[PDB]
Design a protein around this ligand. Structure first.
Ligand SMILES: O=c1[nH]c(=O)c2cc(S(=O)(=O)N3CCCCCC3)cnc2[nH]1
Length: 167
């Protein structure tokens, strides 16, 4: 039993809710919140901009130190940093950005990072400003992630479409 409330169960291990991931994180304080990161951990907009704003820019300060030490992430890769006031940990995961021409096949590799964590609160990778089809992203999630994933979808119209078209 865990503290996530109001989710629709899609599969044995995947759950979905129309929610603001920032507000969901603030209330649940999950062990892991997933950020929709880029390779530079520049959290300017989308999910990343919103998560970072909710930390009063502490996420960006920590991220800049990480990059200065380690260099950029790989597309499809991840790193674990602090969750600040939102979660114990933040798993920064880089899905491919279609608006930069990155290979959508890397979306499966991105979701594989979730399997290193027993339970996660997450957005749909490569959705939103990353330019992928969120229905495809949900399919890859379901077919790749084996751990327990609680997906927060900000847009109510999109959430209803994801549910109604789910196979
Ligand atoms: O404050 C915020 N809370 C959020 O949950 C959030 C989620 C996303 S999104 O890319 O995952 N997306 C989901 C796909 C398309 C619908 C529109 C949103 C972007 N910005 C956000 N800002």
């Amino acid at each position: 039993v865990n503290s996530f409330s109001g989710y629709l169960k899609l599969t044995d291990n995947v759950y979905i809710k129309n929610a603001d991931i920032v507000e969901e994180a603030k209330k649940v304080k999950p062990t892991v919140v997933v950020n929709a990161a880029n390779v530079y951990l520049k959290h300017g907009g989308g999910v990343a901009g919103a998560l970072n704003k909710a930390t009063n820019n502490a996420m960006q300060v920590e991220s800049d130190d990480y990059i200065a030490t380690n260099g950029p992430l790989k597309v499809g890769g991840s790193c674990v940093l602090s969750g600040h006031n939102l979660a114990k940990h933040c798993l920064h995961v880089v899905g491919p950005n279609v608006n930069k021409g990155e290979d959508i096949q890397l979306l499966k590799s991105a979701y594989e990072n979730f399997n290193q964590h027993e339970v996660l609160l997450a957005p749909l990778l490569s959705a939103g400003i990353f330019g992928a089809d969120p229905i495809h992203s949900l399919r890859v999630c379901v077919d790749t992630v084996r751990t327990n994933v609680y997906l927060a979808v900000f847009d109510k119209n999109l959430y209803d479409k994801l549910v109604s078209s789910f196979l």
